């Protein structure tokens, strides 16, 4: 029974793949962490394969739906999930096959850069994007895709090239967030989009995780600064959580998984660097519990014929 | 004759307490600086006690006025003056009683973080905050409170935790200022609020003062960068001063005292580091003269039954 | 046949002077680079002299046109080209006569700081600047003028003072760009102003070029970060180029020459530091070809009686 896969579902393998990598970084401190990493990584990779196959079907048989999402000044952003997750799967696979991993990383990096270059810039022509288009999802092509390239390139040994992507994402972040939070202040985000508030958790933690990958895990002043703003945003989003889910818990809450998983990844580096170890443990446990809850609610929905379109 | 204390009056002990700390930092260069520091610090602490007592009375007998200021998307910010000044008084008291100082610092830090977490985030629900709510006072809970925690925690020996607060404030600053200055460009701030333009002086100087506390007074590239933007803002506000006071000099001009006092504090570190010593001397003298003028106009108003509500 | 010189034409000597300085920095790697630098520098200096003479005539005989551009919340910005180019000519002249160079640098630095202090701040009074005034040209007095002072002061040996100007420009940039790109998203820039999109290329490259002047050419994390965002903007502007010139190629395209020339200058430092040498070569060649095309189209227009007003 054919159906067009909602692009946002790539957030599921994305969150799982990022959490696999966080656990990978604990292996030398806690050897059993590698088994947990490998299991999360295989599950994320499997889900990614499936979703890539489903999306290839969407492109072949439901192309006009993709074209409409592509030209939308709001919905285009979710497409960036595709190359982001491709890169994270490459990072996972690198532990087993660096050749295949490097192919996936380059495909994702070229694909996300071509994507942004075509669409993010086109917004600057005016008249299509409106004030009401100012959504957290914009972080995906503008910010998160660049941080993911930064960290993946560093994994491959291209640290200086990674810094270029890092810079592109960090400055893009700082340049978009002001107008986003002002818009949220003035305009009440409608319930159907509120789960995407979870993406507001992402920038500072995805940023510091990419930074720590490129700088060999040196926890310095910048990294601490980023963690500070990251936790501020976490506390804000926690207070806002009842309003976020005013209309009920739903699968869109996977939007939080990117920032959660990056908070866990960055915590491993803070722990290794003997900076705020107690905070690190808390951060790492919290993010795992929250993602575990997402998995449980996803298994629940799956067994009730919900989930898919 | 009972009366409800206007919350903004906490700006007076705030400015004096911050100026006490600036002088404290000169003691080893100029021993008489410690007497000047102690006198400013005792006066600020005394005024703070009084104002805290008056505000406790406001909470008990005029609670609905506090509730209205609290839920206002503009007036809520002045409440942040309370924990900020509590921390600065703790910093002063630390020279005499580190135990009491540490209690005040933690009360202020927890109180300001709870405050922001409850109210600054709630703004993101939309529909209450309006474009016309975009006032410089927002810096108080969003930016200045975090910088004050950063510096106070560093005083207590919690440097890495201080960096987290520093980061939260520095990034929050950069994220709010763009929309503030655009709003000021487009919308003429009404005279009754114009004294609060003085708060625009604060961010860069309060930032660098907190930075220098946490990094042991090392005047590095970041510190110089911050000073640069700080002076730009000073020059802009000086040119704007006749327009700020178009409707007359008033007590609201204490709004400038936070940035002035922080400019004096940061100047002590620049002087100790042998960076721009001539600029430092100028900055330190200027801020003291300006705060001295504020004291004189406050003594004036006090002797004319003006001042209080 | 008297005529009032359009202020924007100072962009021509500006671009050429900045490109002279980029080549100057290659002299020790490639000795023939000094001849290319000297020729570009003499041509830029000659054009500057002429344009300064023409503008002195405009001030004497067409003063009301200058007054109107000065008080315009949009057109005032182009006036900043005057002190910027004065400084860059001083930087060029320094190779032959450091005394004269230092006079020009100080005149430009004092002039641009007085200019911004008078006009950029005055915008904050509200009611004159409108949303539709949010143009890329604002970068000139707010950002580029400060970076140029930073680098020129460093040339003169005033590195710490240069850092203050650097800071003023870097933070000003970060504070304006968010509202600029949001405005471009929402409002289609009209064709007659679209050439000024070229100024969007400038900030990151002019920033890193100034940074590298003040920090003795040390290619560090900040410099790489800036280059990253710089290239992102380049790719975006390249995709947008057909829309920029939808109504035809014109002399306003000299607006791109500031970012192009700074990209070439920064590339010399990256090359000297053995960072991304291949990218550096590409950047340096690209910018030269693009500026060469501008020269060719300018010679073309000159020989067809176009060009001047
Ligand atoms: C995975 C993301 C892919 C997004 C699909 C790109 C949409 C391209 O867009 C369309 O392509 C058509 C021709 O094929 C043109 O005729 C249309 O003008 C254009 O709208
Ligand atoms: C995620 C992998 C990369 C996506 C490539 C999408 C190809 C889009 O294709 C191009 O997109 C432009 C959009 O601005 C359209 O104007 C063009 O019509 C179209 O050819
Ligand atoms: C908007 C966020 C910007 C913050 C970045 C500035 C932090 C840079 O901090 C720098 O880091 C080095 C390593 O710890 C320190 O040694 C330097 O002395 C310090 O200036
Ligand atoms: C990001 C957090 C990941 C690391 C979690 C490890 C939790 C271990 O716990 C710690 O183990 C130590 C020695 O191994 C003990 O010294 C500590 O006191 C104990 O807290
Ligand atoms: C020092 C700052 C304190 C701010 C006062 C908090 C305002 C709380 O708010 C009020 O509390 C009431 C119950 O007591 C509720 O009934 C109301 O719904 C709520 O408006
Ligand atoms: C400065 C010291 C800390 C202030 C604590 C204030 C307690 C506020 O109280 C809570 O505030 C919420 C506001 O968003 C309200 O919604 C709640 O009704 C109220 O209980
Ligand atoms: C928006 C403001 C951001 C500016 C922060 C960047 C400045 C960081 O500057 C860094 O500081 C170190 C200490 O001086 C230097 O040694 C580093 O080499 C330099 O990259
Ligand atoms: C932030 C500024 C605080 C310090 C102010 C000190 C002013 C002292 O003045 C300085 O004293 C020096 C030696 O002590 C002399 O060498 C200097 O030339 C003189 O300028
Ligand atoms: C090179 C830039 C110079 C800009 C010209 C400044 C415009 C000054 O402005 C004008 O000056 C007049 C008196 O001379 C006043 O009468 C006017 O009120 C004022 O508009
Ligand atoms: C580029 C060299 C420096 C330019 C100096 C311009 C002098 C402007 O002159 C002043 O400008 C003010 C504008 O805000 C006006 O209000 C004043 O009327 C005018 O005297
Ligand atoms: C918005 C842009 C802000 C980015 C500035 C932060 C970069 C500062 O980076 C700092 O630079 C030093 C020199 O390479 C490093 O050694 C420090 O360890 C690093 O923290
Ligand atoms: C910003 C770029 C400026 C420098 C351009 C130089 C191009 C020279 O080319 C380089 O010359 C080298 C030795 O001199 C050879 O080793 C290289 O392989 C070759 O690429």
PDB file of C-alpha atoms and ligand atoms in Angstrom, chain B residues 55 59 63-64 66-71 79 82 115, ligand 5:
ATOM      1  CA  UNK B  55      10.177  45.296  48.701  1.00  0.00           C
ATOM      2  CA  UNK B  59       5.100  41.865  48.464  1.00  0.00           C
ATOM      3  CA  UNK B  63       1.158  42.057  46.010  1.00  0.00           C
ATOM      4  CA  UNK B  64      -1.088  42.811  43.006  1.00  0.00           C
ATOM      5  CA  UNK B  66       4.170  42.976  41.962  1.00  0.00           C
ATOM      6  CA  UNK B  67       2.020  40.442  40.151  1.00  0.00           C
ATOM      7  CA  UNK B  68       1.247  42.954  37.427  1.00  0.00           C
ATOM      8  CA  UNK B  69       4.906  43.920  36.976  1.00  0.00           C
ATOM      9  CA  UNK B  70       5.807  40.209  36.942  1.00  0.00           C
ATOM     10  CA  UNK B  71       3.358  39.324  34.124  1.00  0.00           C
ATOM     11  CA  UNK B  79      12.600  42.422  39.061  1.00  0.00           C
ATOM     12  CA  UNK B  82      16.842  42.212  42.988  1.00  0.00           C
ATOM     13  CA  UNK B 115      13.271  33.944  37.332  1.00  0.00           C
TER      14      UNK B 115
HETATM   15  C1  LIG D   5       9.423  38.815  43.314  1.00  0.00           C
HETATM   16  C2  LIG D   5       8.603  38.345  42.178  1.00  0.00           C
HETATM   17  C3  LIG D   5       7.371  37.592  42.457  1.00  0.00           C
HETATM   18  C4  LIG D   5       6.321  37.639  41.382  1.00  0.00           C
HETATM   19  C5  LIG D   5       4.926  37.193  41.745  1.00  0.00           C
HETATM   20  C6  LIG D   5       4.449  36.012  41.007  1.00  0.00           C
HETATM   21  C7  LIG D   5       3.152  36.125  40.381  1.00  0.00           C
HETATM   22  C8  LIG D   5       2.402  34.844  40.362  1.00  0.00           C
HETATM   23  O1  LIG D   5       1.253  34.844  39.594  1.00  0.00           O
HETATM   24  C9  LIG D   5       0.030  34.630  40.086  1.00  0.00           C
HETATM   25  O2  LIG D   5       0.008  33.817  41.364  1.00  0.00           O
HETATM   26  C10 LIG D   5      -1.318  33.527  41.736  1.00  0.00           C
HETATM   27  C11 LIG D   5      -1.426  32.739  42.983  1.00  0.00           C
HETATM   28  O3  LIG D   5      -0.717  33.148  44.074  1.00  0.00           O
HETATM   29  C12 LIG D   5      -2.058  32.807  40.635  1.00  0.00           C
HETATM   30  O4  LIG D   5      -3.350  32.715  41.112  1.00  0.00           O
HETATM   31  C13 LIG D   5      -2.066  33.571  39.383  1.00  0.00           C
HETATM   32  O5  LIG D   5      -2.651  32.807  38.351  1.00  0.00           O
HETATM   33  C14 LIG D   5      -0.763  34.097  38.962  1.00  0.00           C
HETATM   34  O6  LIG D   5      -1.021  35.216  38.185  1.00  0.00           O
END
